[PDB]
């Protein structure tokens, strides 16, 4: 809960079955290009290869997986320290947002805020964020190397039904923060009690009335048919 | 179905606070080849750490939920083959009694 950054991170395995340059790049939120994994671990702090590979492959006897990770090391080789790895990431905006000191500072923040927002969105938790990114690459390769089976998108345990209460949570939040801005608006106007309790009531009503779970009478894309009239033909119905 | 229910949403911390005091090594201090076969622990897709003998932990966890201490709606699965122990406090999961 709270703001709810629905930022999805992909870890892509470039090059197909029987092609050279089987490189691993990851599309990071608020970043134009797909950054090679090694630059990430380095930008994260994990500077040398092997320290990077330790996070990805755990068994030092799994040569098959490691040979697969060799081109990644090659790709990343260009960048060497934590700083030059962040600068490379800052070079790719947004837009770009010119100035060296600026681009380096960006990427510092994208990692704290946008990158793997769960776990922690705090500061010094690079350790956790790395081991996890690695756990992802590990799972990515495990499938390419025909060991784990490709995830069933339609497995039920992987689904969640949003019931009555959480449907309201999404709605109440949207409107409370809409009141919160009108609250700041009347506090501003006070160059020296007028807090419109209507927005919340009318909002909740509009929503449960139409079924249009959006904001507000200006609907699409809102999500309609959420609420609906209770069928009363028979007690079964 | 007539027996189907939905997870309301509980707190992960009383399980996180428990797990540490039960044999969980924090992820900040992991040595991938020193402790290699270590069963990795996740609470709501957040990788928290590793446990040495998951069989003992899995038995203590199951008993808290079955007694009452850990909420009964809290999902907890141990894949022996995959060497993982994933726990769920997550609101939304459809459950059934058995």
């Amino acid at each position: 809960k709270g703001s709810r950054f629905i930022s999805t991170l992909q870890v892509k395995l470039y090059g197909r079955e029987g092609s050279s340059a089987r490189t691993i790049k990851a599309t990071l939120p608020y970043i134009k290009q797909d950054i090679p994994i090694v630059i990430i671990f380095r930008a994260l702090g994990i500077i040398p290869d092997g320290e990077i590979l330790e996070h990805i492959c755990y068994d030092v006897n799994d040569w098959q997986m490691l040979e697969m990770l060799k081109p990644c090391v090659e790709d990343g080789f260009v960048i060497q320290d934590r700083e030059t790895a962040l600068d490379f990431i800052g070079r790719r905006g947004t837009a770009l947002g010119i100035k060296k000191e600026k681009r380096i500072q960006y990427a510092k923040d994208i990692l704290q805020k946008e990158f793997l927002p769960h776990i922690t969105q705090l500061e010094g938790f690079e350790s956790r964020k790395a081991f996890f990114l690695g756990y992802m690459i590990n799972r990515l390769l495990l499938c390419a190397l025909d060991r784990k089976d490709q995830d069933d998108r339609d497995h039920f345990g992987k689904k969640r039904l949003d019931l009555a209460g959480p449907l309201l949570a999404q709605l109440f939040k949207t409107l409370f923060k809409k009141l919160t801005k009108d609250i700041f608006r009347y506090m501003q106007r006070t160059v020296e009690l007028a807090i419109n309790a209507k927005t919340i009531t009318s909002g909740l009503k509009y929503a449960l009335a139409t079924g249009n779970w959006g904001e507000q009478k200006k609907a699409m894309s809102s999500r309609a048919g959420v609420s609906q009239v209770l069928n009363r033909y028979t007690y079964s119905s | 179905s007539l027996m189907s229910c939905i997870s309301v949403g509980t707190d992960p911390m009383p399980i996180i606070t428990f797990l540490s005091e039960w044999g969980m090594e924090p992820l900040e201090d992991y040595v991938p080849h020193q402790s290699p076969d270590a069963t990795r622990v996740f609470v709501n897709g957040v990788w928290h750490g590793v446990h040495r003998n998951p069989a003992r932990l899995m038995e203590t966890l199951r008993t808290l939920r079955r007694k009452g201490d850990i909420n009964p709606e809290v999902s907890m699965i141990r894949d022996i083959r995959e060497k993982e122990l994933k726990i769920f406090t997550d609101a939304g999961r459809v459950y059934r009694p058995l």
């Binding site: 709270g2 209460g165 949570a169 939040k173 409370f176 923060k177 609250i183 | 309301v8 949403g9």
Partner: peptide, 30 residues
Amino acid sequence: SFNQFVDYTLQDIICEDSTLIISFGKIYVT
């Protein structure tokens, strides 16, 4: 579901970015 929403979820949405230059305390439902 609604019970979890009133008893808890509601008290939570009430204070997350609530504090304004004026913050919000405990919520009461008649």
